[PDB]
Amino acid sequence: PQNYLFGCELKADKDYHFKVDEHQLSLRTVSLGAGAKDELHIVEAEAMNYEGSPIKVTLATLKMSVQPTVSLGGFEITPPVVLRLKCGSGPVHISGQHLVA
């Protein structure tokens, strides 16, 4: 399956909507930006579950002073996908891989 690089930046007032016209999106790591203030950050991913109902999960919790980067080592998800932050001014960078077969 062909692999491409994928990246996006998420802030307090901005979410990412990964949409496709089989495709898969696995997240390698989530990183904190230089300008992020000293407070907690929590990343959420919304996708499809087995019961045909959209769900929310917390991808990771990052903090500047504790753990600036948290690698999910490829958190595979079927698109469409929604990435959001519930707290933190950001920016936060989600780096993943877009797999198309």
* CA separation for the pair 6, 95 (Å, rounded): 6
Local structure of residue 85 (DSSP, 8 states): E
Find the angle CA(31)-CA(89)-CA(10) to the nearest 5 degrees. 50
The nearest distance, CB 100 to a copy of itself, in angstroms, is: 6
Binders of a copy of itself among residues 75 to 94 (CB under 8 A) are 75-78, 81, 86-87, 93-94
Amino acid identity of 88?
G
When asked if residue 17 is in the footprint of a copy of itself (CB under 8 A), the reply is no
When asked if residue 14 is in the footprint of a copy of itself (CB under 8 A), the reply is no
Local structure of residue 37 (DSSP, 8 states): -
Binding interface with a copy of itself (CB under 8 A) = 2-7, 20, 23-24, 28-29, 31-34, 40, 42, 45-50, 55-78, 81, 86-87, 93-98, 100
